[PDB]
Structures are given as C-alpha cells and as structure tokens.
Amino acid sequence: PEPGKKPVSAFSKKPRSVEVAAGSPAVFEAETERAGVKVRWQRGGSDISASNKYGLATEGTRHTLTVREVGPADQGSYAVIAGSSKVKFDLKVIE
C-alpha cells in the first residue's frame, strides 16, 4: 500500500495540467504554503526564469507562470521547485 501522508511540502496548491492549442497562450498558477522563498520553474530540459517569452508573477504566496510562445517545442514535462519541495506537471500541445 501507499505510505498515506507525504513529507512536509511547500506548495499550498499544486499546479494542475491543462491543454493548449499551438500559438494559443498558456497560463499556470501555483501557490506555496510559506512565503519569502523564491520559486524556480523548469521546462522539459530547460529552466524557466523571469525574462521575456515567459512571465513570472510573484505576489505574496502566489506564483504565476505565463507562456505566450508555447508550441510543438514545449511538448514534454515541466518541473517546479519551491525551497526543498519537488513537483512536476505535464503540458499537452495538439497540432
């Protein structure tokens, strides 16, 4: 059987998988139980940072990731790490 309860985690809300069309904008919302900690985002094999093409919005305990250039390239998996907590989610793109 499964353990039952996971080790203490830093995410209040886990980002959930969604589906996006090619050229269609994509927005992900994630939340953390504790504030004051930077949240790092990872794309299938490449890290995501607060720079253009990608958008990071950090308000209080809420972190938002926005991708407007998402296409066939982005098909894969995304990982997000807040402090010591490891979590990942899948993005689906249809041609």
């Binding site: 794309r43 094999g45 490449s46 720079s51 093409k53 250039e69 390239a73």
Partner: protein, 370 residues
C-alpha cells in the same frame, strides 16, 4: 528557454534551447543582381537573403558573410541574425540569453567582437560562447574520447578525458569541405566544364553533397572508371543545363584523405587524428581509438567510417579493437550541442554577465572560458 545560434560557414542554424532540432536552417548568403535585369513589371528586388537566393542562384552573385570562421562584413551577419530572430524563431533577443558555438583554437578577436555585438547590437542580459568539440561529445553521450570536428570552414580535433582537457593535444587542420569545393571546381575545368562565378560555385558543392562518395580504394575505382556504367550520373541544374560526372565525383572527397592531389604537405584527416592522439597522454590513448566520434558537414559521405576504421586499425596497435561512431545528422550536432549545453542548470551560472563585461572588459572571455 534560451536561444541558440550557429554561425558556421555558409549555413546559419537557429533555434530554441531544449529542442532536438532547430527552427531556422538557411544559407548565410546575400545575393545581388550583377547584371541589369530585362523584363516588365519586376519589383527589381535588389537584395535577396536566405533560401530565396538558392532558387534564383544563377542570376545572383552570392556573397558569404563568413570566410574561414571569420566574418568579412558585419551588416550582412546582422541581417542573418535579424532573419533568424524575427522570421522562423518569431522571438525577441531580449527574452533569452543567447548561445553561440565556436570552433577550437579560433582567434581572440572573433570572441571579443562577437560578444560586443551581442551585448551592444542585440540587447540581452547574458550570453555564452561554446566550443564545438565538447558540445558534439554531449550529443554522443560519452564522457571520454577524442572528437574530430570538421565544419564547413575548418577541421579541428579535440581529445577529452573524463571532463579534463589537453590544450596542447588539440590540433587544427586547414582541410575542409569548402576547400574541396574549390579543388573540385578547379578539377572540372580540365574535363571541359568551367565554373568561374560564386553563384554556380554552389552548384558543384550541391553535386558533391549527394552525388559524391568515398571509395574503399582510390586506385581501383579509377582503374574501373575506363568502363564506367554505374559511375556516371546526370545532374539537372535549375538553369536547365545537363551535367554528367564519372570518376570525378569520388576523387574529390578523396583529397581530405589524400592532400597530395591538392599539393599541400599537411597530412590527411586520418593521419591528423593520429597526430592528435600522439600529443595526448599515453595512458588515455588506449580508449581514444575505440571512442572516435565523427562530426560536421564533410563527414556525411558514406564509407568514411569504414575507410577510417581500417586505416586507423592498421596504423594503430592491433592489441585493442578500434571503434568509430559516426551517427547521422552529425552536421547539425554542433547546433544540437548548443541547445543541450544551455539546458544544464550548472551552465546558467557560467553565462557571461553584462555587469562583468562593463567592469573587467571584453578580454575576460578567454579568462572565463576556453
């Protein structure tokens, strides 16, 4: 993500970091009409850039922005970069750090000027200059070996042992596919076909890429070319002219193997790889021979791996097996290495910051990286 641009000879490869294949592949050429045009209603398009030039190649006088890994004219390069950023990529330079891949033992001026243009002409928070031999190795997925990297411009060999490098052991060779193209055009004239213009110069190169192949034994094919049947093929030009080649196609790739036809003292590609091995430490030599990796545009022709294997095995000791790995699409391996290289967490810390440039100066590139 991140942006990766390969500014090699004749072709500009552009794409996004983390992607297995680049978004934009097109020749780095600018074509202008040498001769006055005759027609009514033509837009008279003075400048042609990219693959458009390839279609209208006969009328246009093609010019290469990059010669021997050196860029002759900076504005043409900007048009190329502009074309890659806003055409096929459809992204802004501001958005991500930009990774450029450079061949081993390249001049100091090229790295300093290249970074200066990227910091000034295209504003980006950071950039990094990579080395082709190490990036090719990553595509291979092997920690230890010797990498022979032959681009469209200059062939280079860079051995590597478990991540440690030997700068003395690295050897630069002046033999390349572009050189073969010049030899090739020179060889065609004796037969009775002459090409003296850059625009038709590409036509012989095109012939070389698919029609040309490497003979198991040079002397035997020449001997059997007297009664050629399957040795001759007909190539159709966009112009409409018909070209028939025979023993001529296989003796061209041969020159890399046999520089004597060229008239130069320097040894061929198999001897040079051997020389690089000799430079390297004796202990690490034994797995160097079995870990040989082929890369670049001039390694595409079939039979190269088989000819190299027999030649390396005979020259080298017989106490160990000789293995050569030559995967397909090795031409694009250098660009691929750039996309994978920018995909490592450790690597992002390593990028050359704008602040560091402003304080320390342009000369810090050699200090910071190989």
């Amino acid at each position: 993500a991140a942006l990766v641009i390969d500014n090699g000879s004749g072709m500009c490869k552009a794409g996004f970091a983390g992607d297995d294949a680049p978004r934009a592949v097109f020749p780095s050429i600018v074509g202008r009409p040498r001769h006055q045009g005759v027609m009514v209603g033509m837009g008279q398009k003075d400048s042609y850039v990219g693959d458009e030039a390839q279609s209208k190649r006969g009328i246009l006088t093609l010019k290469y922005p990059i010669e021997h890994g050196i860029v002759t004219n900076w504005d043409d390069m900007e048009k190329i970069w502009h074309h890659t950023f806003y055409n096929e990529l459809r992204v802004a330079p501001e958005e991500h750090p930009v990774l450029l891949t450079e061949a081993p033992l390249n001049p100091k001026a090229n790295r300093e000027k290249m970074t200066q243009i990227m910091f000034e002409t295209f504003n980006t928070p950071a950039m990094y200059v990579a080395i082709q031999a190490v990036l090719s190795l990553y595509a291979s997925g092997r920690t230890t070996g010797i990498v022979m990297d032959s681009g469209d411009g200059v062939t280079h060999t860079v051995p590597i042992y478990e991540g440690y490098a030997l700068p003395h052991a690295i050897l630069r060779l002046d033999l390349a596919g572009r050189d073969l193209t010049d030899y090739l055009m020179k060889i065609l004239t004796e037969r009775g076909y002459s090409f003296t213009t850059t625009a038709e110069r590409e036509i012989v190169r095109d012939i070389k890429e698919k029609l040309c192949y490497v003979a198991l034994d040079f002397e035997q094919e020449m001997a059997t070319a007297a009664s050629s049947s399957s040795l001759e093929k007909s190539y159709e030009l966009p112009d409409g002219q018909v070209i028939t080649i025979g023993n001529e196609r296989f003796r061209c790739p041969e020159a890399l193997f046999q520089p004597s036809f060229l008239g130069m003292e320097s040894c061929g590609i198999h001897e040079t790889t051997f020389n690089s091995i000799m430079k390297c430490d004796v202990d690490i030599r034994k797995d160097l021979y079995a870990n040989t990796v082929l890369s670049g545009g001039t390694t595409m022709y079939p039979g190269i791996a088989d000819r190299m294997q027999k030649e390396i095995t005979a020259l080298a000791p017989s106490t160990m097996k000789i293995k050569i790995i030559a995967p397909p699409e090795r031409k694009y391996s250098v660009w691929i290495g750039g996309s994978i290289l920018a995909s490592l967490s450790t690597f992002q810390q390593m990028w050359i910051s704008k602040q560091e440039y402003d304080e320390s100066g342009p000369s810090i590139v050699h200090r910071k990286c190989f």
